[PDB]
Amino acid sequence: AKEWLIFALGTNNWQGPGQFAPGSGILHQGQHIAMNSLEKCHCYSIWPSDLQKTPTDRDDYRVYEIPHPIPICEKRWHSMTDEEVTSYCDNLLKECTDFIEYIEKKHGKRINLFLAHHCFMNPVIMSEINERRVAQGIPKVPLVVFAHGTALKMYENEINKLPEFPMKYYDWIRGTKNIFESTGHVSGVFAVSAPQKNSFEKLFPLFPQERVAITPCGYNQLVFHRIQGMTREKAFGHMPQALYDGFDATQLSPVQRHVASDQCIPDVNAYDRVVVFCGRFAHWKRIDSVLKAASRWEKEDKRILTLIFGAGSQETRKLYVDMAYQTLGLKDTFFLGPQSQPDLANVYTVADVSVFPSHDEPFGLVFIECMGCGTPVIGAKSGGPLDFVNDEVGALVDEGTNDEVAERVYAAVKQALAEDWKKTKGAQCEQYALKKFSLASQAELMLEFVESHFT
């Protein structure tokens, strides 16, 4: 058996006390846990944060501690001075090489896999680290990149001459750094979705297409599984409503009066059924389709409680909250903000069905997590859900306008509740997620693929 000693350079913070993570940070964290699960495999990770700190009680990860928010492709990279970019990158490279030295000394073994998130500075840094090694007569270590899509969109914006994307990185990464111009620097790319594989190949046409594959994505079954004895009061009854700053609670109708900043949902046990959404408040998630669906079913006085989890900017929180309460007249729908993964597992455990009606969801971890807890799922016929949602575990509604998708979600929820998909499909959902998408199984497949294709 091959012994793996892996070093993984992440772009985003992990989810921890005091700071939620974006989906690409969740994915890195999960991959870390997964690879460390495997016999004969250690994985060591570094990632940036302005809020979280390197732990002093454990050695498996470090934090690149920075005094400003993490730079994003689309605080933008383009907004930084060339000096700031250089120092950010130089300092990160230095912290990477110090960690690598620690690992190699501790194990008496060289690292034999470099993982880098996104198609920008992380592969640049790791490629440079390899150059310095080969210059001392040490073998380069294979470098595998995770294409999440944001660096790719930034390059496309640069090429398309969008405001705020004056051309700076794409030409450099091709013509100076040559990162994806052969396999001399990068051994393989995993993309989260087919659209990202397509986009990568167009931008980097000298990279072998056969070395770009779809990332085998997994969920954390240790957290997301059916939580025995969970109740609605335990799961979400102590969760304060999260609206937006300056929300005016006087502008509510009599039946809306339970909606209030920082207050729990009263009498959760009184509702008949529980419908859940979870996702960041990006327009393509179509939270408004969920709200419009509830606008219809709340009139029918089946007491359906709808719970909106996830984070957004103040502007986007204001868009959906006002849409809920002012435009749509909702009264049994509540915003609970972002929540920890174990909190979400409790919620999914007691939910009747979850609705995630995204347009072109890249993969859809939320789906797998929810199914992992024994709960059926409703999506739209687009993106990654097309591959894994089937009749045994939920439903995908036909694509269309936000309004059409809303009506179709309404019909699908009505079906789910009428037919009791929680009861008839729930066991299926959990068995299917576990079998197909558990973290460790996926990481085993991922490393097999690395060994056969990228080494």
Ligand SMILES: O=c1ccn([C@@H]2O[C@H](COP(=O)(O)OP(=O)(O)O[C@H]3O[C@H](CO)[C@@H](O)[C@H](O)[C@H]3O)[C@@H](O)[C@H]2O)c(=O)[nH]1
């Ligand atoms: O309140 C929240 C919301 C989300 N999550 C976690 O974050 C994940 C992703 O949530 P989402 O809102 O979909 O984030 P995105 O950043 O949009 O996710 C991207 O990244 C994921 C991981 O690669 C892919 O599965 C998605 O399809 C892709 O959109 C969830 O599954 C959870 O694990 C939480 O822990 N708490």
Ligand SMILES: [Ca+2]
């Ligand atoms: Ca060795």
Ligand SMILES: [Ca+2]
């Ligand atoms: Ca990318």
